[PDB]
């Protein structure tokens, strides 16, 4: 019973961590794409 309660708490923590990884990773990918677009714009603007 003690092990089962600890396991349930661990499972909840793991699920929250996985959700954070899915969210933080998605945010990082979006930021990287935006940064690449900004860099291309700067490269074009600099040439002009």
């Amino acid at each position: 019973n003690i092990l089962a309660e600890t396991q349930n708490k661990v499972q909840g923590l793991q699920e929250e961590l996985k959700v954070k990884m899915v969210e933080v990773n998605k945010q990082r990918e979006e930021t990287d794409i935006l940064i690449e677009k900004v860099g291309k714009e700067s490269a074009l603007a600099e040439e002009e």
């Binding site: 003690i2 092990l3 600890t6 708490k9 661990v10 923590l13």
Partner: protein, 48 residues
């Protein structure tokens, strides 16, 4: 080889019962946030 095995089976049975008893007391004493980061508990689960 038989006699050594029988002595090994007795030894292993005493070590297993110590590990189970060590796990129950370690889980109760350790906090739910500490259990996830506790190195001793991760090592203990591998040994078992």
């Amino acid at each position: 080889a038989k006699q050594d095995l029988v002595k090994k089976q007795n030894e292993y049975a005493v070590t297993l019962d110590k590990l189970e008893s060590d796990l129950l007391q370690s889980l109760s004493e350790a906090d739910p946030a500490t259990i996830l980061d506790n190195t001793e508990l991760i090592q203990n689960l591998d040994k078992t």
